[PDB]
Design a protein around this ligand. Structure first.
Ligand code: FES
Ligand code: FES
Ligand code: FES
Ligand SMILES: [Fe+3]
Ligand SMILES: [Fe+3]
Ligand SMILES: [Fe+3]
Lengths: 448, 170, 433, 170, 170, 425
């Protein structure tokens, strides 16, 4: 609460164990991150027709997200303004109205209160429904993906993605009809701080060869070279002003797909158009395997095509939802095949994801002890081996294995935690990457 | 459908008890090769919470599922457990299955359609305990000596899984 | 918080979501409601003979309630003054003493420490037992119902019930030998704030036709100075009994006497169906005859104990019938009660999210269509369906939360109903009309 | 009392497995009319925690109970679920019953006294899970070919129920 | 090893059911004298969490164990419960055993080696509930139309016991 | 939060119910007791050869305790200094290194960060491993027993044991090769405050006859650093049965104890002790159970139960002592199972605020105790009494009141002043 928290050290690239444990830090996160940032709600594909809806979370708040008659999307708090009862218990469906089943108050697709039983008889038409709408949430969309935000002071979704749009356009727009989500989602609880899985997906190439040694063995292919973390640069790491980042393994997009050829065919068939629309430097990314996150709590693997949102449940627990990304114009069997392969590797019984659960939970619960918790966590791998790049926006780290994206994630975390409002964040837009002090890095690299 | 005779019912329960023993003792290769048919479909669909009014069909093998595997895919899942690099299973965990309500019915060519309830208790490390309940819908064929399963559908009771994973066989 | 909380808006008639969720609010309710009010313990009928006891709760505190030798009733904290062990683990029974099974200290029916093993050998008779009694609780009774109170500065139980007595007399004393409680009670946990089921019973006629729609397909509102209230459906007491018969008949044979003793305007209510509550956490249905106490377990959970109300002079078959019908509808497997569970829990737990929690809950239905009544004391609302009793409940909730002691509450005895501004509501209605 | 033969025991367990299947699949009408006799007494007594020294008799059908029903009252309880206004069951919940320790005994007039252990696992909504264990004491009669229950006594293990309700059949 | 015949399997399951009934009803003396052989070794080893590369032998009866009893030692465990000074059992607690996966095999001299899974649900006081799962490995010998256990090995699933005690028989 | 808390009344001898319940008080114990004092880790006998290790707790922190190549013992926090993952999940074994299995950082037997995968190619050798050792814990041993301490300003273990060493030498060194521990330990959770079990073992002879009615002449001792015990004369069995190896062991060695430590310590050597080493280690000498009560917040503990056996006892005698100690005091103990509710109930009653507003009595035998001409510390007459409670809570309060070890040492010479009957003996 100091205005310059020591919980994250952006000079020495380390973070206090308190960030995975302390309740007061978590409550501030809820206030200065989750109640201020754009959060992933889903995709138009999950509610593609007028009246379709899903229920989802924004952190610990339940919402209803509905495809309006006009074809726009709206969201509101899933709680009645009478005595607060949850309005909708279905995961999805089609509805022109949502009824609270305590006393029967009726909400429209935008959360407006449209009808109350006995309005004339018992309320004496004295209740004004206009003031009793379920609480609205701002909704914006980008390439079909739907985000929500509680803060009227937030930048637009497009400005919040910012230079990350350079990268997301590559994959979400792509060379065909673009990516979309396929549900229903898996949902499970995990006893970890929300930041452990997010940092893992945003920036953790290092763990893959150790943690997932057994699974990589069974899969074979390009990714098996990673097994054991042994002296055999693979790719690149990226981070941006609002914390978004990813690592990329060149040429590896379909590498986990064992069967699997519709997706590889799709990439080969559409990559020429990515080169046309986005350039050769983004074509490179289009066929690479990414592990990334959209700050604060949406993660994904592009290639493998798992897509997760990690909903906090207090400082020591999450509920994670897992969808599949597929090209909207991929043929039915390719869509089903991608879904099978992403789920077998990264679903609730994932051959890789199952290895991660203890990594996540343990790094959290060790801090139950006061002596253990009085310490810093290191994310210095590859510091100085990164900086601004003449083609790629943001900050780019050489190699796939490093902690560039941890550094960018925690630098923005601290910025949000220290900022009393959005205006205070925006005030530092130009200098966000001054902590990445190797300004000449790529000038030397690209002409050596 | 025609309920099996008490003698065949006996044989199916004995099969299921042997299956449980193999899986509780980490004899996964023996389970897969000895008790699962090469034409297996092993399927655990994702069921969402839908209003009664919702007319959409139930999940098919073309739709989201936690497991949706053929024999080679199960083999990969089983083989990964024999790596000494599955850190989460060193030291090893414990699993115990309680199978009840076995009802077996006659199908064609001497095949059987079989239903059961399963309760799964999992223990690991020092204080970790998780519990699952499912229904199981099997198609079995006789493999003197024994049965092999060639269709297995597993129906989880919980919408949100309260465990770090569902990496166990049923 | 301060002396004039914004957690409840009495104008306006709305309450902050925080009152179902916030721990600080809960803890202050423990200090200024549960540690200060008269709490429902049971009825003489639950422990009818000398030495008869029950164990029960006062909010989060465990008590033993004992029928003394002299025919009076004492209660004391169910915790030993040596190392604090719980003394008694039985629901009910007969005892002339209560032994703590850790070291064997023995307690009287009033909580006095009467004997300790090896007092002479090991303690060298140096232990001052009179200093070591299990902490007493004030007990008073009203028409056989037993209440306890922790606050020595608190008013008398009959003052606490105050004008609500006018109504309780109608049913508790009634036209026969009166009502009593039949146990053993059902007990269950429910993940809701204690105020959700209490406000439902005190004032919620509105949900009945919607929530309990499945079961159904098979009047007036009152509130008082100390929060007590109920709603009444005229001529309906047995409406939710499937059988007649013993109860129906009991009413008819006893109504004439209610009219004589209490007047024709208390007889109207004697034969009505009530949903009511005694502030803070005792609720009941008169007619259906379920009787509940909602014991808080922190802000997000309760343990609810459910008894049956019966005429004390009814015959065993009639008492049994009422128990069956009261349990089938409002017991743990109740054909109506089972419908309410998610209503209670959901209204509490949606507030886990901070954005959701930042809001007020609306209880304005019928604001203004209520006021002081000619005949009936307190404040009365027209119709069975409306929210008058919610409004009076939360008004007193707010009054207790603001007040640092009972004196400060007593200070406002003459001013309590100012917030109901339609003073001339009933005159206008009755003159019209 | 004399234990039934192995063949009769099989029949009683088959009956119980079918009953569980109807109750798990929402076939409440089919259960009530096919497996419950018109003279049913369905009874779940409330037991208090009493000292060993206490001499009061155990509860009778004249005393407090969560369920104390004849056929018509059970039918009411069943029919309510078909109303389409049980909001708590839209979307629907899950229930799964684990029945074990079935022991049947020859009674009078070809009737059977049957004891069993029941573990009931309930799931609903996203993360709600509740569990109950009970003893069951039945009197069954032949209803050729099959059985109907004409007395059912259910003995709950927990004094305080850790569930919103006890609204499920056993 | 050779599975017993279906008739012997039935007899073993019936015996286990009767055993559970006695233990659920506080007939501990009846259980011990009727169902436990005088040569009994009743054993519940402590298993520690070891890396797979650990080559140390599994626990023997010479090593740490929660129970490691002969008949006289079990008798003493039983007789304690009849003292009338068992304050934690006044009022009495509840216990319910769910036995499943009974697999019996032919040993020598007509003895049986028998494997089973047990889930134990315990309830006490108002809200206390604890749950245990164990593997049981018995050797039984025939006893005048029943069996008696002469070796009983109990394998607990949890390293850290989440209950005040393990003072119940299996 | 003052340097004179009213939660313990030493005049007087009562303690506030809040000490069993309040979270703030718990957090202060963690700071001023568990992060300050020497805590029981185990015994050399548990990791007796170079490379052998155990995992254990110090209050809520997990540690690895390792027998080094040079025969010394070191401990370190069981949590990686990269992202914090627990390093070692084995209860015991033998290891030259401990690998974190998230990214594979390798820790030496002293917790030094010895290797990291791809240190050259990927960290560019810029990672300073010297700065990233898993946090060390000071380890000291006394008569084979291994203790750990987090405070660099604490007295040596031998000074922390101080005058209790007079008593520990009697049983731990004894008349032969000394006592050791036998594992693996039982472990269980119990819903009680950590002090309830401890006060029970330290000073509670009173409950034995009531609580342990089934199944079926001394002094009490307390010391400066809270350590205490009660002794029943001539009862060093008395659950082992007359002729057995344990009995034969006491008979064959008590002559040595008389020679080494005198006749006043021969008396205690054949007595049955219930004792505690402050804060959270308890034991029964005779029965030979040995427990460490790890707190898990104010309302729960995880208790670990080992057996004490003579190191030179034959295998059958070690096994026999193990079987009797476990049958009586293990997780299914014929005595221990009786105490569970006493522990938990004395904790959870305090859920209600009215209940919690009160004091708990430990006055039994006040004034029937004082300093003693042969036995160091404070010695109360008779086995049944609360002398040990009084010494326990007195030192509990001193530690809670003191900001550091220096302020504890300040009152060394005046510790027993609360025991006013100076000439009792
Ligand atoms: S709470 Fe929603 S209608 Fe009343
Ligand atoms: S705690 Fe009650 S007698 Fe000691
Ligand atoms: S967390 Fe231990 S190696 Fe990374
Ligand atoms: Fe991973
Ligand atoms: Fe209702
Ligand atoms: Fe004891």
């Amino acid at each position: 609460m100091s205005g310059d928290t020591t919980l994250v050290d952006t000079v020495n690239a380390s973070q206090s164990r308190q960030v995975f444990w302390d309740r007061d830090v978590y409550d501030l996160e809820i206030e200065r991150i989750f109640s201020r940032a754009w959060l992933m709600l889903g995709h138009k594909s999950l509610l593609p027709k007028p009246g379709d809806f899903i229920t989802t979370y924004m952190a610990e708040d339940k919402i209803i997200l509905s495809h309006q008659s006009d074809g726009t999307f709206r969201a509101f708090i899933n709680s009645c303004t009478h005595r607060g009862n949850q309005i909708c218990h279905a995961d999805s469906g089609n509805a022109k109205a949502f009824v609270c089943n305590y006393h029967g108050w009726v909400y429209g697709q935008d959360g407006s209160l449209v009808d109350v039983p006995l309005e004339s008889r018992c309320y004496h038409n004295k209740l004004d429904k206009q003031e009793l709408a379920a609480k609205s949430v701002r909704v914006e969309t980008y390439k079909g993906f739907i985000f929500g935000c509680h803060d009227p002071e937030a930048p637009s979704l497009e400005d919040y993605l910012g230079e990350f749009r350079f990268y997301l356009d590559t994959i979400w727009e792509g060379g065909g009809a673009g990516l979309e989500l396929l549900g229903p989602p898996m949902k499970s609880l995990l006893h970890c701080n929300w930041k452990v899985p997010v940092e893992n997906f945003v920036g953790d190439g290092y763990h893959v060869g150790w943690t997932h040694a057994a699974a990589l063995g069974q899969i074979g292919g390009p990714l098996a070279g990673l097994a054991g973390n042994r002296a055999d640069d693979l790719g690149l790491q990226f981070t941006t002003r609002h914390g978004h980042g990813f690592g990329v393994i060149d040429n590896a997009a379909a590498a986990i797909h064992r069967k699997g050829d519709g997706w590889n065919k799709y990439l080969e068939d559409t990559r020429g158009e990515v080169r046309r629309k986005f350039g050769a430097d983004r074509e490179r990314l289009y066929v690479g395997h990414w592990n990334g996150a959209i700050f604060p709590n949406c993660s994904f693997l592009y290639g493998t095509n798992t897509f997760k949102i990690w909903h906090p449940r207090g400082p020591h627990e999450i509920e994670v939802w897992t969808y599949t990304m597929v090209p909207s114009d991929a043929d039915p069997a390719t869509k089903s095949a991608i879904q099978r392969e992403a789920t077998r590797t990264f679903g609730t019984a994932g051959t890789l994801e199952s290895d991660d659960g203890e990594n996540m939970s343990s790094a959290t619960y060790v801090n139950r002890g006061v002596i253990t918790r009085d310490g810093m966590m290191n994310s210095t791998m590859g510091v100085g081996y990164e900086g601004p790049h003449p083609v790629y926006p943001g900050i780019v780290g050489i190699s796939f294995i490093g902690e560039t994206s941890y550094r960018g994630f925690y630098r923005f975390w601290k910025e949000m935690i220290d900022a009393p409002d959005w205006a205070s964040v925006k005030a530092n837009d130009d200098n966000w990457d001054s902590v990445f002090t190797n300004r000449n890095f790529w000038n030397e690299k690209l002409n050596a | 459908q025609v309920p099996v005779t008490p003698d065949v019912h006996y044989a199916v329960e004995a099969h299921y008890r042997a299956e449980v023993r193999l899986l509780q003792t980490g004899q996964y290769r023996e389970w897969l090769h000895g008790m699962v048919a090469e034409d297996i479909h092993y399927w655990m669909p994702i069921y969402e919470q839908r209003f009664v009014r919702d007319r959409r069909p139930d999940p098919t093998p073309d739709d989201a599922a936690i497991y949706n595997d053929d024999f080679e895919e199960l083999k990969q899942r089983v083989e990964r457990l024999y790596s000494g690099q599955v850190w989460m299973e060193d030291p090893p965990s414990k699993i115990r299955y309680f199978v009840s309500n076995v009802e077996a019915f006659e199908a064609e060519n001497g095949e059987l359609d079989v239903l059961s309830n399963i309760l799964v208790y999992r223990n690991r490390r020092q204080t970790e305990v998780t519990v699952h309940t499912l229904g199981r819908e099997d198609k079995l064929r006789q493999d003197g000596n024994g049965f092999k399963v060639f269709r297995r559908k597993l129906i989880l009771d919980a919408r949100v899984t309260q465990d770090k994973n569902l990496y166990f066989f049923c």
